[PDB]
Structure formats: structure tokens, C-alpha cells
Ligand binder design. Structure first.
Ligand SMILES: O=Cc1c2[nH]c3ccccc3c2cc2[nH]c3ccccc3c12
Lengths: 327, 288
DNA sequence: GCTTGTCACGCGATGCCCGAT
DNA sequence: CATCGGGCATCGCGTGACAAG
């Protein structure tokens, strides 16, 4: 023995007893290091002290046992319905709290994030922006590091509320950001990534659809009947492509073949999907009967590339927007 | 510049920072425990004291719910994908919709929304993530609610379903678990020959303040001043009689600020190149 | 085969406690 | 009522062992 080692042993004993009480699974406590043991002890105490003053049930008129069981999980239900995670950040840009689902969206462990600097999770070029939001309602966007790539852009919707019970020095409480971070919606676009996905549609002479194969149902999202009850195919065309499609329809009327055209179709989700199509005229007794269009879905990248290298220059060429379709 | 010394010095300063971090965390503990100048072992023993008193998850379910609701409001609801039958609704439905927990139970999500939306509701309930915008009721009065949720296999794990429970005979296979929360330019558009917005340019936001989803489905006359409504209507009726010809009309469009904006609309018809029938009416709407 | 970080250890400079002045 | 020297406990520092990555 010797006094220094005695004191270190007592310190480590107190540290282990602190680790034993942390509200984490045992496999998480075992991997912890003493510094983060102290860190999350402090963070748990701060959280409990805030909840001691800010916090505090089915209507007894409508209370069943199953409803009680669901009420005992209401919190996790909300957390799962968030489609994202919770963030509570102090004025020092310290993470007062982050929900577990942050690991679902960024790859960071909740116990590694709590009581740490928020900027370590946020892209440099955006950190300044975040600061301006920290100093009542708030709605903005930020790029956070995603270990599952590497960054992810996310919408933060939250508020600035006083983080009570922090016992700073006694100083008054400071404004903390209570926000929900959710991923960014990709633009209203549909890009089939399944390779080799050419599909054919059948139409009458005015381009009103009458038949379609399985891959067409998969990409466009309509049932076979649903395709043919909503007017001609021009009811399905993006307004930036209507005139090009009309020109190529005239070309097919005059020569039987349309040539390769690139344009956007309206899915049943009311999204736009790019297609490179080719319309051929089928004949009955030497007279035109119906149209056989064969389409290959494109990505947004090469779609905008084809649009930017457009042969004809027609009005509404660069227009963007949304549409609906009725029967 | 002598690697062995650079490594030594940076390592020394690294655990110097480590020691400082440990001391700062101990000081925070001293600040956050009850009874408390004491030394490190005193503070650690009193921290064990307090933590044994206070005590798996970092937060309780109610603490997590409190954090989420403080963050961005909302009320949780759980409905069956089959009939829309409301399995569960939180008490948050009272501060959100001004409705008792009681009007939603024993009811159906279709009965709580606007009729013009029930179809879309079926859209969102048939057959993971879901996100939509509807109008729920609070003469009756409705309100726009943004709903974000997911499809979950029913019944949920952990929750016991007794025999005499009312949920015991339902037997729904899937559920929707969601949160509901209350929330000089020009642009082009395509309408049917009645005036209903069927295509809206995004620039409408910079032009009249509305988002495209707020215009699509609505007739343009709904946004026109009552004294200019017949004029705009006859403009639409005349542009159909004169195929290809352009007709301009000036009227007052009510922006979403409920402000009247003078707008010039140029309309013409798109003809099917085979049948010469009208597909829609193209309008360019410009501020004045 | 190198980097960063955790943990123990030795080692003195001060702290605390307390008979003994 | 202090002040004063023991002996052990706290406490901060630098370094070496060891491992995850
Ligand atoms: O109505 C134009 C159209 C078209 N409308 C549709 C509606 C539903 C599904 C597919 C289509 C479709 C495919 C097309 N392929 C074309 C080549 C040249 C010119 C026009 C078209 C055209």
C-alpha cells in the first residue's frame, strides 16, 4: 500500500458507484470511461433538476386497461412519430439532451452526445447560422454530421424556453433551444433506381391511355383502369414539357414515329418522374389505329441535363411547379 | 522538431485537459446536489447519495413526452388502418384542437376531418412513414393540421390486452401512430375549362403568397374580387370559344395576407394535336 | 505500424486533524 | 485561548503501459 494509491482507489470506487446508477443499459455502462461517467452523471442531475420544476393521464371518462398501457408509452410513441430526434441545447451550445433516435439518423450514440458541444455535430459552414438561432418560435435548416455515410441536411423546428434549475453562478435561467430535427424532404420527384426498367403504354390516337404493363404500374403508381379514366396523356404532362410532347405527337402523326423525347409524367403521388419515350403508330387496314409508347425512366440529373441541352426552345421550358389530376 | 519531445508534451497536455475536465465535472456535481466547501470524495459520495435517491432510459416516458411537446406541440393519435377507428388519443388533443380526449375515442379519423379530405385519408391509410396535411374539427369549424406518423404492427409489444377490454375484439392488423400539429413577378398555371387550378407554377409564392398546394384543386374565381368574378368567368368562357386566341383580363386576387393585388391574366387553350379538343387553359398571371 | 486516448503509478507540495506545547 | 510540528489524506503533474482504431 501507499497513500496516493489508497486515495486513487477510493476515487475509483466512488466513480464505479456513480457508473452503476446511470440510467443506461449495462453494456453501455461497461464501455464508459470515467470522464464520461462524470459527464452523464452531471447531465442526468441537470435533466432531473429541470424536470423537477417544469414537469407535473387518460381521461377517467374513457379509461381502459389497454389505454392505460398505451398511455404509459405515449412518450416513446411520440418519439417514433417524430421521424427524427429531439435536441435541447443550452446557451453554451451544450447538448442538454438528445433522444436515442439520433443514432437512427446520424450514427451518434446518445450517451456520447449529451453534455457535449453541439458544434461538434454541425457542419462548419452552418455553425454560425445555428448560433444566430440560439440567441421565441424557431424554424430553420442545418447540416449535421452523419456517420452513416458525410452530412445530412435537417429541418429544426422548435422554441426558446428558459432552462430552469441549472443553479449557475446565483444567475437566472438562460434560454435553451427545444427543437425537433427531421430529415429534408427530397423534391417532389420520383426516380426509379431499379435498372433495366423499360415499360410500355398503349394509347388511342389522341394519346388517351388504354393499356399499360406491370413496370408501368410500378413506376407511375396507377392501376390500369386509373390510367384511362383521367383524360388524355396531356393531363399527365409537366407544363414545361407539354409543347415538346405536342410537337413530337405531330411528328408521329406525320411520319408514324415520334423520335426519342424526354419529359416528365405525373405519378399518382402527384410527383414528377422523368422518362425518355418513343411513340409509334400502329395501323389497321392502312389507317392509324392506336399508339404504342415505350418509356425508360430517368434520374433527375440526366433529366435536367437533357432539358438543358434542348433542341427546340419553346415557351415554359424552364417552368417548375405542381399539378393534380381528376377523372 | 524532436518527435519524441513533441509527442511527450502533447500527451502531457492532453491528460492535463483530462484532469481539468474531471475537476470541472466534479464542480458541476457540487453545484447540483442537495446538501452543498467540500473536497472531491465528499462531492462524489453526495452525488451517489442524490443519484440513489432519484433512481432503462435517460428520461422517463413523461419527461420525453414533455420535451417533445415543449419543442413543437402536437397531439398523438393511433388509429386502425382498416376503418380509421381511433385506438388512442393523448390529452394533448385538448390544447391542440379544443376537443376532449372523449370526442376522439370510440370514433373514427374520417369523422374528425373535413369530408373533402376523407378520400385523401384513405390514401394515407391503405396497406412505413406517412406525412400529410388535413383539416380537423375543433356551426362547426375546422383547422389545418400537419400529421406525421408511421405504420405499426398491432397489437404493440409490452402492452397487455385483457380479455374484457374493448380493444380485445377489434383485432386490427396495422395502425397509424402519428402526431398532429396546428400550422412585381408572375407565374403560370393550367386550369380546366371551369377554372380549377390543375397546375400551379411555384413562383405563385413570390406572386400571391400561396403555396402551390393551396391553389391546386380550387377554382380561380374563389380568389377573385366579387365585383370582378363575373368578368373573369366570362373571360374563361370566351377563351374556350376562340381556340388558340389569347385573352387578357385584370382583376383583384386576394393574397394570403388577405390583401387585394391587381393581376393581369393572359389565357389561351391547349389543343390536342390529333382531335383539336381542349386539354386545359394556360394562364400567365402577373402583378400590376 | 502510427494516433489518440484511457488508466495506473510515482512523486512531491499542501490540506486536515490533533496532541502537545 | 491560540501556535506548532506528526502523520496521513488531497491534489496536481508528468510519464509509461496498453488498446481501439
Ligand atoms: O401524351 C403524351 C405522352 C404520354 N401521356 C401519357 C400518360 C400516361 C402514361 C404515359 C404517357 C405518355 C407517353 C408518351 N410518349 C410520347 C412520345 C412523343 C410524344 C408524346 C408522348 C407521350
Amino acid at each position: 500500500s501507499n497513500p496516493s494509491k489508497r486515495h486513487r482507489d477510493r476515487l475509483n470506487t466512488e466513480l464505479d458507484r456513480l457508473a452503476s446508477l446511470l440510467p443506461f443499459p449495462q453494456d453501455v455502462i461497461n464501455k464508459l470511461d470515467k470522464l464520461s461517467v462524470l459527464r452523464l452523471s452531471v447531465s442526468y442531475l441537470r435533466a432531473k433538476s429541470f424536470f423537477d420544476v417544469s414537469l407535473k393521464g387518460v381521461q377517467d371518462n374513457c379509461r381502459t386497461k389497454f389505454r392505460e398501457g398505451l398511455n404509459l408509452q405515449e412518450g416513446e410513441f411520440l418519439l417514433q412519430a417524430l421521424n427524427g430526434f429531439v435536441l435541447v441545447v443550452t446557451t453554451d451550445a451544450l447538448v442538454f439532451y438528445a433522444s436515442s433516435t439520433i443514432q437512427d439518423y446520424l450514427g451518434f450514440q446518445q450517451s456520447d452526445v449529451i453534455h457535449q458541444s453541439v458544434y461538434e455535430l454541425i457542419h462548419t459552414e452552418d455553425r454560425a447560422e445555428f448560433q444566430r438561432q440560439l440567441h421565441m418560435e424557431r424554424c430553420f435548416v442545418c447540416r449535421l454530421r452523419c456517420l452513416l455515410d458525410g452530412f445530412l441536411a435537417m429541418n429544426f423546428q422548435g422554441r426558446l424556453k428558459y432552462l430552469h434549475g441549472q443553479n449557475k453562478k446565483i444567475l437566472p435561467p438562460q434560454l435553451a433551444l427545444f427543437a425537433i430535427a427531421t430529415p429534408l424532404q427530397p423534391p417532389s420527384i420520383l426516380e426509379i433506381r431499379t435498372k433495366n426498367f423499360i415499360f410500355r403504354t398503349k394509347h388511342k390516337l389522341d394519346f388517351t391511355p388504354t393499356g399499360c404493363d406491370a413496370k408501368g404500374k410500378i413506376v407511375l403508381g396507377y392501376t390500369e383502369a386509373e390510367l384511362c379514366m383521367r383524360g388524355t396523356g396531356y393531363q399527365f404532362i409537366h407544363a414545361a414539357d407539354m409543347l415538346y410532347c405536342a410537337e413530337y405527337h405531330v411528328r408521329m402523326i406525320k411520319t408514324g414515329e415520334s423520335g426519342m423525347i424526354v419529359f416528365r409524367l405525373l405519378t399518382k403521388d402527384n410527383r414528377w418522374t422523368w422518362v425518355q419515350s418513343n411513340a409509334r403508330l400502329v395501323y389497321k387496314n392502312g389507317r392509324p389505329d392506336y399508339i404504342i409508347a415505350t418509356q425508360r425512366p430517368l434520374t433527375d440529373e440526366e433529366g435536367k441535363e437533357h432539358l438543358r441541352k434542348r433542341t427546340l426552345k419553346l415557351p415554359f421550358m424552364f417552368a417548375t411547379g405542381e399539378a393534380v389530376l381528376y377523372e | 522538431m524532436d518527435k519524441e519531445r513533441l509527442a511527450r508534451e502533447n500527451h502531457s497536455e492532453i491528460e492535463r485537459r483530462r484532469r481539468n475536465k474531471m475537476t470541472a465535472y466534479i464542480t458541476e456535481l457540487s453545484d447540483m446536489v442537495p446538501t452543498c466547501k467540500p473536497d472531491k470524495l465528499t462531492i462524489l459520495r453526495m452525488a451517489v447519495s442524490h443519484m440513489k435517491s432519484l433512481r432503462p432510459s435517460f428520461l422517463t416516458d413523461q419527461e420525453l413526452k414533455h420535451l417533445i411537446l415543449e419543442a413543437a406541440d402536437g397531439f398523438l393519435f393511433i388509429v386502425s388502418c382498416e376503418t380509421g377507428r381511433v385506438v388512442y388519443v393523448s390529452d394533448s388533443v385538448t390544447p391542440v384542437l379544443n376537443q376532449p380526449q372523449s370526442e376522439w375515442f370510440g370514433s373514427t379519423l374520417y369523422d374528425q376531418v373535413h369530408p373533402d379530405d376523407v378520400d385523401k385519408l384513405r390514401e394515407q391509410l391503405s396497406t412505413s412513414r406517412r406525412s400529410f396535411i388535413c383539416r380537423m374539427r375543433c356551426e362547426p369549424h375546422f383547422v389545418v393540421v400537419h400529421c406525421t406518423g408511421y405504420i405499426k404492427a398491432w397489437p404493440p409489444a409490452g402492452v397487455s390486452l385483457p380479455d374484457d377490454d374493448p380493444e380485445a375484439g377489434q383485432g386490427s392488423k396495422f395502425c397509424l401512430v402519428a402526431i398532429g400539429r396546428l400550422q412585381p413577378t408572375e407565374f403560370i398555371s393550367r386550369h380546366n375549362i371551369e377554372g380549377i387550378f390543375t397546375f400551379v407554377d411555384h413562383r405563385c409564392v413570390a406572386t400571391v403568397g400561396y403555396q402551390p398546394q393551396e391553389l391546386l384543386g380550387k377554382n380561380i374565381v374563389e380568389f377573385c374580387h366579387p365585383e370582378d368574378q363575373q368578368l373573369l368567368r366570362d373571360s374563361f368562357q370566351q377563351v374556350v370559344k376562340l381556340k388558340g386566341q389569347v385573352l387578357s383580363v385584370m382583376f383583384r386576387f386576394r393574397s394570403k395576407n388577405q390583401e387585394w393585388l391587381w393581376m393581369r391574366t393572359s389565357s389561351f387553350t391547349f389543343q390536342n394535336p390529333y382531335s383539336d379538343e381542349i386539354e386545359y387553359i394556360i394562364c400567365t398571371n402577373t402583378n400590376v
